[PDB]
Design an enzyme around this catalytic site. Structure first.
Site: not given
Ligand SMILES: [Zn+2]
Length: 168
Positions: A45, A50, A90-91, A132-133, A136
């Site tokens: 994701g 991000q 998470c990236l 989660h996304e 962000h």
């Protein structure tokens, strides 16, 4: 193109995204670059904020053959129920994982890559990924759910990792 993914403690990760006015070729370019970036870093994701693009766009692909692409533009949580938690990654928070409380089931409304509306009911890993996304996009990270001690420890881990990775 592969875009650079921001890491904590970057303050641009705390910005609140604007809704997409119109899904046009510029937006579709961003969506395509976001997928390319997500697959390049091995994520499932990615939210636009991000990659320092502050609009309400999310890409997800949990598939192993990288061919079940899901695009959420201007997502809207219609309903949620239950409670779960897995150890999320998470990236933007490299190599750190932590269990975080989520709703178990989620129903959203969003636009696809063509700008057509759709509704989606999700549970399991997908429900958690969407929540989660969506976090962000309003400046929230999964570490925000944890104790101050756990948060500091995560920050340090990442700062040390970026310190070593930048060699010179
Ligand atoms: Zn994330």
């Amino acid at each position: 193109s592969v875009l650079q993914v921001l890491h904590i403690p970057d303050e641009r990760l705390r910005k609140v995204a604007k809704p997409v006015e119109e899904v046009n070729a510029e937006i579709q370019r961003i969506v395509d670059d976001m997928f390319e970036t997500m697959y390049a870093e091995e994520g499932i994701g990615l939210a636009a904020t991000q990659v320092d693009i502050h609009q309400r766009i999310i890409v997800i692909d949990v598939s192993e053959n990288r061919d079940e692409r899901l695009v959420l533009i201007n997502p809207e949580l219609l309903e949620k129920s239950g409670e779960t938690g897995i150890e999320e990654g998470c990236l933007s928070i490299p190599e750190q994982r932590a269990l975080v409380p989520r709703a178990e089931k989620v129903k959203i409304r969003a636009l696809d890559r063509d700008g057509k509306p759709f509704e989606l009911e999700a549970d399991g890993l997908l429900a958690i990924c969407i929540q989660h996304e969506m976090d962000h996009l309003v400046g929230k990270l999964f570490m925000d759910y944890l104790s101050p001690l756990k948060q500091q420890r995560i920050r340090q881990k990442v700062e040390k990792l970026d310190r070593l990775k930048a060699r010179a």
